[PDB]
PDB file of N, CA and C and ligand atoms in Angstrom:
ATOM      1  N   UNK A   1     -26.026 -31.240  46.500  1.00  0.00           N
ATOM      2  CA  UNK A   1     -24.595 -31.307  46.251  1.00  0.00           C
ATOM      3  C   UNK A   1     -23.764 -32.046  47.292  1.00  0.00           C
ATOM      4  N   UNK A   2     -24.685 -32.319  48.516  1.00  0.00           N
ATOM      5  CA  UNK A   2     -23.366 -32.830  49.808  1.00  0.00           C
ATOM      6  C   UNK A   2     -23.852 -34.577  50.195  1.00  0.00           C
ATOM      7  N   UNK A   3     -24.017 -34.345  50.703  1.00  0.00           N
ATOM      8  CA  UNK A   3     -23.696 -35.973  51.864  1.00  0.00           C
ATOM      9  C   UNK A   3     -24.812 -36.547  51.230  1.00  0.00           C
ATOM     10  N   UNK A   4     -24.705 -37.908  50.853  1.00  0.00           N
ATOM     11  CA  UNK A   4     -25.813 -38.927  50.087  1.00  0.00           C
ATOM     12  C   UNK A   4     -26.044 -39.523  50.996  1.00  0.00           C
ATOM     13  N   UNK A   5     -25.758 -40.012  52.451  1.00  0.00           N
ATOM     14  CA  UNK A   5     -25.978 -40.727  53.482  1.00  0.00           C
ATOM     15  C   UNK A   5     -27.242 -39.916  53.936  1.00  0.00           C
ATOM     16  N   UNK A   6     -28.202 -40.934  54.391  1.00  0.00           N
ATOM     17  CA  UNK A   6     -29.445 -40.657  55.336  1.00  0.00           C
ATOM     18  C   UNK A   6     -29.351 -39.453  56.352  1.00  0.00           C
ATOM     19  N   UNK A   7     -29.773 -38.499  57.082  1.00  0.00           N
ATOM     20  CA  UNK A   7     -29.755 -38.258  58.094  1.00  0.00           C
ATOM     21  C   UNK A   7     -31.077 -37.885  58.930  1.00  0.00           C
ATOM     22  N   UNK A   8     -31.182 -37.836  60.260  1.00  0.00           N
ATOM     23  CA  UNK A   8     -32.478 -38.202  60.812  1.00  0.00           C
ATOM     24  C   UNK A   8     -32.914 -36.618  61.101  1.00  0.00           C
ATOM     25  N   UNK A   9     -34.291 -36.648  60.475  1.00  0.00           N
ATOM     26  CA  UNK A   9     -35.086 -35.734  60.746  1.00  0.00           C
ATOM     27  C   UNK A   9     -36.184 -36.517  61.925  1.00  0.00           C
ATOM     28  N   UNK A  10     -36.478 -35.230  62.602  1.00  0.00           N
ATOM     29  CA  UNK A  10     -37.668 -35.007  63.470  1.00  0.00           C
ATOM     30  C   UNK A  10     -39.623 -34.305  62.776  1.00  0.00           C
ATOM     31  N   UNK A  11     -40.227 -34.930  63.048  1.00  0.00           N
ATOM     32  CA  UNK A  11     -42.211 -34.340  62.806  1.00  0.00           C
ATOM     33  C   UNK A  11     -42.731 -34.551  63.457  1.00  0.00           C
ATOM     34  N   UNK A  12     -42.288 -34.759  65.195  1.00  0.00           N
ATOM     35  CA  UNK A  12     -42.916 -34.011  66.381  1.00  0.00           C
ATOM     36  C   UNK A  12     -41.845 -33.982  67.624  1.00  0.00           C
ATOM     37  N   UNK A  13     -42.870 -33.058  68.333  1.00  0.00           N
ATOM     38  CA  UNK A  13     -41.898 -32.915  69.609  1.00  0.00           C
ATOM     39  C   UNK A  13     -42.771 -33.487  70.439  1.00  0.00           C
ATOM     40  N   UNK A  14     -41.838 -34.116  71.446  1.00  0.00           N
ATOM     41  CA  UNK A  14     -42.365 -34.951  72.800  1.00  0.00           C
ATOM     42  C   UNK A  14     -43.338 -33.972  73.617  1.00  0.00           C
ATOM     43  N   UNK A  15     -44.453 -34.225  74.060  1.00  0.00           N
ATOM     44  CA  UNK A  15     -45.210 -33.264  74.534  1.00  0.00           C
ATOM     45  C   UNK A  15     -44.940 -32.860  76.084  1.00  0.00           C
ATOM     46  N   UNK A  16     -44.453 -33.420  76.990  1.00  0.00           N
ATOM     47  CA  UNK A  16     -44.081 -33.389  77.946  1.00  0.00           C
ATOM     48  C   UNK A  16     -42.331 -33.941  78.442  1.00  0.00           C
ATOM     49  N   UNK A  17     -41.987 -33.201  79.433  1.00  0.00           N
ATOM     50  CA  UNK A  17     -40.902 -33.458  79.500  1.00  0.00           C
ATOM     51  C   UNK A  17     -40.408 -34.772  79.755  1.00  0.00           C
ATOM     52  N   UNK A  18     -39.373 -35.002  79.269  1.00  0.00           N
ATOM     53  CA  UNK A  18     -38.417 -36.527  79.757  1.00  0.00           C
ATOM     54  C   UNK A  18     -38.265 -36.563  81.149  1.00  0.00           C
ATOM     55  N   UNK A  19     -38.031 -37.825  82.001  1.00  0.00           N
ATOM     56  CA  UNK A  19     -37.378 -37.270  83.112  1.00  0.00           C
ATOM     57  C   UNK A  19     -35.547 -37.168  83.154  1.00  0.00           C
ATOM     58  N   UNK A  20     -35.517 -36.356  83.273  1.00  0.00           N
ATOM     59  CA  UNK A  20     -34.110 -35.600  83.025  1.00  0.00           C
ATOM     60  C   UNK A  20     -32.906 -36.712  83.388  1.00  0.00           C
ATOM     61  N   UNK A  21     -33.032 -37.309  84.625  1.00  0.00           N
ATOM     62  CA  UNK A  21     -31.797 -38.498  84.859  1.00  0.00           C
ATOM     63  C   UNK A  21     -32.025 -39.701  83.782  1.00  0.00           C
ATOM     64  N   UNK A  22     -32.959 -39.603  82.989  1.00  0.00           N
ATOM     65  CA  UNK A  22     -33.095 -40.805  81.791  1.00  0.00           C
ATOM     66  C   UNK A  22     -32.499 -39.917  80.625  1.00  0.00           C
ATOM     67  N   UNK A  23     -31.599 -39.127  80.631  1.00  0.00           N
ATOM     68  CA  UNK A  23     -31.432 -38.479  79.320  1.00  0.00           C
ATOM     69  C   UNK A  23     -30.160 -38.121  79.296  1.00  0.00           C
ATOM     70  N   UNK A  24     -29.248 -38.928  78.785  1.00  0.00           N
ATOM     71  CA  UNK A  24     -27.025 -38.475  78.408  1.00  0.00           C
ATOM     72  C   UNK A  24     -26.806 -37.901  77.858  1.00  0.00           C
ATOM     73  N   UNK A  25     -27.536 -37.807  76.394  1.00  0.00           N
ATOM     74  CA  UNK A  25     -26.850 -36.971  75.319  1.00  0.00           C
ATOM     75  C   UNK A  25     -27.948 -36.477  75.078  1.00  0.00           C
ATOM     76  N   UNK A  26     -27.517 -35.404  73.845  1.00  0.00           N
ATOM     77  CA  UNK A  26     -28.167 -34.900  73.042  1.00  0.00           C
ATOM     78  C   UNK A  26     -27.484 -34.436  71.907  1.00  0.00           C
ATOM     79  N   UNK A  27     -28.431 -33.718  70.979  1.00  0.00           N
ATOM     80  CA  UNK A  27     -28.183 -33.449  69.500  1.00  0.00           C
ATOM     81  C   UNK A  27     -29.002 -33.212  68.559  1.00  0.00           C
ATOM     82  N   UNK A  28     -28.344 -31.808  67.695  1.00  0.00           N
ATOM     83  CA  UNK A  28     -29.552 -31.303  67.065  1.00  0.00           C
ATOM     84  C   UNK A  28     -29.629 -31.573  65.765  1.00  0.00           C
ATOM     85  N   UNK A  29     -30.698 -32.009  65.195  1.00  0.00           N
ATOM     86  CA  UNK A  29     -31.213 -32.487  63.819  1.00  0.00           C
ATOM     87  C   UNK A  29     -30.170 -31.530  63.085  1.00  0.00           C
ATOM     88  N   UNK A  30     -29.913 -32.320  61.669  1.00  0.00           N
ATOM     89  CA  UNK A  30     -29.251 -31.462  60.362  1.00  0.00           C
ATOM     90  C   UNK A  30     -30.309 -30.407  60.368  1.00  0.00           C
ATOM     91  N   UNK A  31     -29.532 -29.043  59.802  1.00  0.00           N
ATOM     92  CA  UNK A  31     -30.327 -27.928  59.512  1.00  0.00           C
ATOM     93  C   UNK A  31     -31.155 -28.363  57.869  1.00  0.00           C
ATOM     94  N   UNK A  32     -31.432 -29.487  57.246  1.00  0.00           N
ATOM     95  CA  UNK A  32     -31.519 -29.569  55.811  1.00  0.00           C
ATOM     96  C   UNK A  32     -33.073 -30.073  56.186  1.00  0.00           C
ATOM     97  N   UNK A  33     -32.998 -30.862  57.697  1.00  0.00           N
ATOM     98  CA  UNK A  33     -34.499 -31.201  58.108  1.00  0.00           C
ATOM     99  C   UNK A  33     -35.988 -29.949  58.194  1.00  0.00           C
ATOM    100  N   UNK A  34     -36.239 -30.203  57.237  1.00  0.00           N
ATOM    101  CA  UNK A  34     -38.240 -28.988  57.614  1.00  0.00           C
ATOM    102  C   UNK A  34     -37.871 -28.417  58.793  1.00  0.00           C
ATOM    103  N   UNK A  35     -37.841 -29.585  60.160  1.00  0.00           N
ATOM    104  CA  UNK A  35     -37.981 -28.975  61.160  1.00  0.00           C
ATOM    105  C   UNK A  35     -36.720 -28.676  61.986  1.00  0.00           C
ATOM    106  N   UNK A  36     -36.730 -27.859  62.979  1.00  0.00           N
ATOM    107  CA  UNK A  36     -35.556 -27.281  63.995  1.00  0.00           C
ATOM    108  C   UNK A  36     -36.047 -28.851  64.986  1.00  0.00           C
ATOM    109  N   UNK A  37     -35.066 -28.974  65.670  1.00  0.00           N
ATOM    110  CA  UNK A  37     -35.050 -30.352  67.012  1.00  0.00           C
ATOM    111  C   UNK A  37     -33.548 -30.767  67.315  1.00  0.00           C
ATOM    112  N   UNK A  38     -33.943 -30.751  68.442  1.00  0.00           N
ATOM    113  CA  UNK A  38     -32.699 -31.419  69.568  1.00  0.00           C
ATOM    114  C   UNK A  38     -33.611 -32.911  69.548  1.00  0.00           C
ATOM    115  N   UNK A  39     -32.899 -33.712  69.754  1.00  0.00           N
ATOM    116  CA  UNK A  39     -33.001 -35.030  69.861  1.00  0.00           C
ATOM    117  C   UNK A  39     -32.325 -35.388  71.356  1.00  0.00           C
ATOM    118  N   UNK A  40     -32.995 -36.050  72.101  1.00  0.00           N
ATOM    119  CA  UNK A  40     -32.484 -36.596  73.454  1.00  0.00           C
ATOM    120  C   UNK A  40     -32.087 -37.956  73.405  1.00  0.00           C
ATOM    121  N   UNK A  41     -30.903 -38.247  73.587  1.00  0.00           N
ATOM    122  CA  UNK A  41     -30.772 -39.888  73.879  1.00  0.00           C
ATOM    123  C   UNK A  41     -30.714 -40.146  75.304  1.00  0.00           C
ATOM    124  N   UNK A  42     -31.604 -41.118  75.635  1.00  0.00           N
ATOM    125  CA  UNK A  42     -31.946 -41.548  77.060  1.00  0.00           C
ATOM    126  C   UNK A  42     -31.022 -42.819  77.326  1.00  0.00           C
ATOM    127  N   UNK A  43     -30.652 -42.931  78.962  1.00  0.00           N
ATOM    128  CA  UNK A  43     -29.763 -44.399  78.789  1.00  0.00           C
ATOM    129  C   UNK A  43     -30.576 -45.814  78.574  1.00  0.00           C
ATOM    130  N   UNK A  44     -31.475 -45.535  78.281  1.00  0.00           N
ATOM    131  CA  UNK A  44     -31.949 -47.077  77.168  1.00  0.00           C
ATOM    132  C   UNK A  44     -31.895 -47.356  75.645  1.00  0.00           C
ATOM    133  N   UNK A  45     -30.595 -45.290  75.172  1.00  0.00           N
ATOM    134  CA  UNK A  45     -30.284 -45.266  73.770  1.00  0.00           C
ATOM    135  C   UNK A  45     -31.221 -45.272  73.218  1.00  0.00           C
ATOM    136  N   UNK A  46     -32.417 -44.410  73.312  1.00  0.00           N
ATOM    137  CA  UNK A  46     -33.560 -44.188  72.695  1.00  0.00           C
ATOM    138  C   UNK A  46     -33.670 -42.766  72.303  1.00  0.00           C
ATOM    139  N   UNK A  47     -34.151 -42.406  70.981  1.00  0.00           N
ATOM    140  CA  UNK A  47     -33.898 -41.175  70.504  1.00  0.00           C
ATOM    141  C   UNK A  47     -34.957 -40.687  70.314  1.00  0.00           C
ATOM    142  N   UNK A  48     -35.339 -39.190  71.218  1.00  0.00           N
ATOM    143  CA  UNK A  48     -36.399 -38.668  71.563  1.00  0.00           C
ATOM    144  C   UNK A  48     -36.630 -36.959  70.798  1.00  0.00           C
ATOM    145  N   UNK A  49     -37.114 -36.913  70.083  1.00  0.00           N
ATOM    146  CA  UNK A  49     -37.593 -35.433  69.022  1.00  0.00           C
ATOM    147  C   UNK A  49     -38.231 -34.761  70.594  1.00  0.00           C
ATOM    148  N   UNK A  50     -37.579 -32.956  70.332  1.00  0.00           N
ATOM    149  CA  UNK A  50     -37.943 -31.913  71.870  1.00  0.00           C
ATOM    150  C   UNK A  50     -37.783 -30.494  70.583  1.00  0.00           C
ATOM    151  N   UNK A  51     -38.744 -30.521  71.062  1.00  0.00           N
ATOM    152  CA  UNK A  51     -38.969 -28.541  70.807  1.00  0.00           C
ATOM    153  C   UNK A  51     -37.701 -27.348  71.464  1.00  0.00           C
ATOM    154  N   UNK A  52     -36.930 -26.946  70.141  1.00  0.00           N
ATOM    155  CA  UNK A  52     -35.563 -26.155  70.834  1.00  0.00           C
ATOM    156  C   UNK A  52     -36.219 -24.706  71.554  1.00  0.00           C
ATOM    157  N   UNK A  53     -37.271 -24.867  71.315  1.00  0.00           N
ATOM    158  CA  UNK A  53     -37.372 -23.501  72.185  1.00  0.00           C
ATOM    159  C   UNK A  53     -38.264 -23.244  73.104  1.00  0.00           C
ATOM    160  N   UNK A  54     -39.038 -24.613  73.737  1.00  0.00           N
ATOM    161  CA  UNK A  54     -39.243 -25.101  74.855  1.00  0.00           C
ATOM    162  C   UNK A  54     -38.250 -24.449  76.101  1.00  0.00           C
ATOM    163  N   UNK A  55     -38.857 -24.331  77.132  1.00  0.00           N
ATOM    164  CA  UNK A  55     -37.728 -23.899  78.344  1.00  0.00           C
ATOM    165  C   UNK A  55     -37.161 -25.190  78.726  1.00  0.00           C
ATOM    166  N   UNK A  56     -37.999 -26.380  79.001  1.00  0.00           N
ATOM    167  CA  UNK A  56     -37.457 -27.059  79.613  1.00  0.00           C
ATOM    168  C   UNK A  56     -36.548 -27.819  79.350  1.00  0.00           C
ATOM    169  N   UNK A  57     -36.584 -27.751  77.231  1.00  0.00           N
ATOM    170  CA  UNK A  57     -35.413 -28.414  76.632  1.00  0.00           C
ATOM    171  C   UNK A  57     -33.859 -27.565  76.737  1.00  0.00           C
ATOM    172  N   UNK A  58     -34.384 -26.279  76.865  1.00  0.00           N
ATOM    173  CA  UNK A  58     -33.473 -25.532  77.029  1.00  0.00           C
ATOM    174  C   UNK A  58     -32.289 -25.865  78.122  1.00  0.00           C
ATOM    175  N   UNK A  59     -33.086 -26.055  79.127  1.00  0.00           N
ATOM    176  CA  UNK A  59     -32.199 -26.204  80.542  1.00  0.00           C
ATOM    177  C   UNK A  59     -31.954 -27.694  80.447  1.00  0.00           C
ATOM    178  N   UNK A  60     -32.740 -28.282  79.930  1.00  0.00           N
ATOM    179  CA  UNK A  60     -31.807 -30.123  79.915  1.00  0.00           C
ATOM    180  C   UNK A  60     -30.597 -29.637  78.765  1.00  0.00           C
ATOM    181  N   UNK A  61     -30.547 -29.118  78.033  1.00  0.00           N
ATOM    182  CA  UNK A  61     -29.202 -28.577  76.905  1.00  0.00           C
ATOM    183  C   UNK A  61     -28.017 -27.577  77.920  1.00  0.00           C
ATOM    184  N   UNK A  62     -28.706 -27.376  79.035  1.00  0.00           N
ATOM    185  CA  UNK A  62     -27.769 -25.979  79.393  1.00  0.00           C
ATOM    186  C   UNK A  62     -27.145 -27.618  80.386  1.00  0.00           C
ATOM    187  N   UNK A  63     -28.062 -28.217  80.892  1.00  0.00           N
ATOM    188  CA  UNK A  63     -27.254 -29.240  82.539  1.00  0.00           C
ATOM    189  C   UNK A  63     -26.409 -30.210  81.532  1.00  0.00           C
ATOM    190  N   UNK A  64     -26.584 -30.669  80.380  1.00  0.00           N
ATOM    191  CA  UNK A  64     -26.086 -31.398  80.070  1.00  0.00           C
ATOM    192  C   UNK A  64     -24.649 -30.812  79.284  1.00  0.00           C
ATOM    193  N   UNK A  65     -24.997 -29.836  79.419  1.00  0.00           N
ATOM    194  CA  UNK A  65     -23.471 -28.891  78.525  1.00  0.00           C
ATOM    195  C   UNK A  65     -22.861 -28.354  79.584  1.00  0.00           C
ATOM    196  N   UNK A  66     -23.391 -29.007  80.992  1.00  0.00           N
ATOM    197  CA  UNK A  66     -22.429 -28.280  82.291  1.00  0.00           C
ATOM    198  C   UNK A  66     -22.402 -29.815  83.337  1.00  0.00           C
ATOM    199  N   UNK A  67     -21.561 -30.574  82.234  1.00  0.00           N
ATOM    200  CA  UNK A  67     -20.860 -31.913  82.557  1.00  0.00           C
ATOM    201  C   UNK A  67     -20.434 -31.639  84.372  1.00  0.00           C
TER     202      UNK A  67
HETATM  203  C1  LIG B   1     -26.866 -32.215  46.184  1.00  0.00           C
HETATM  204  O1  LIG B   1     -26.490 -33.245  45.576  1.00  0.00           O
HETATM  205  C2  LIG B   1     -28.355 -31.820  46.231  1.00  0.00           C
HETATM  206  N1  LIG B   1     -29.200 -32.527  45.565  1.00  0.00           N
HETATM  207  O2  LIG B   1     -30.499 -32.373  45.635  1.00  0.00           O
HETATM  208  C3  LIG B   1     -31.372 -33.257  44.895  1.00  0.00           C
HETATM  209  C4  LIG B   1     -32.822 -33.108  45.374  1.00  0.00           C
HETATM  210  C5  LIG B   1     -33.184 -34.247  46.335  1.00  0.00           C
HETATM  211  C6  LIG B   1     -31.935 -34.884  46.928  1.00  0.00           C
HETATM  212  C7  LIG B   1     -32.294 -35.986  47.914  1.00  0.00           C
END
């Protein structure tokens, strides 16, 4: 019934962590995607699929939400 535009799903998570100063944003997949995922954008604007309930994605979500 809603939005006909594309939106990006995730079907894996990065197996090891990013290094954290390569990573600005973030953002979590539509809930309509199979899977749960935060997506990392790194400053080379590269969009990286992370396991939300990973610790370590956790705390890159907590530093980056404590601008
Ligand atoms: C709302 O328009 C929902 N429609 O679902 C159709 C099933 C596949 C849609 C891509």
């Amino acid at each position: 019934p809603y939005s006909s535009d594309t939106t990006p799903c995730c079907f894996a998570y990065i197996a090891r962590p990013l290094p954290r100063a390569h990573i600005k944003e973030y953002f979590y997949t539509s809930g309509k995607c199979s899977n749960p995922a935060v997506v990392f954008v790194t400053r080379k604007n590269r969009q990286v699929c992370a396991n939300p309930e990973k610790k370590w994605v956790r705390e890159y979500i907590n530093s980056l939400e404590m601008s």
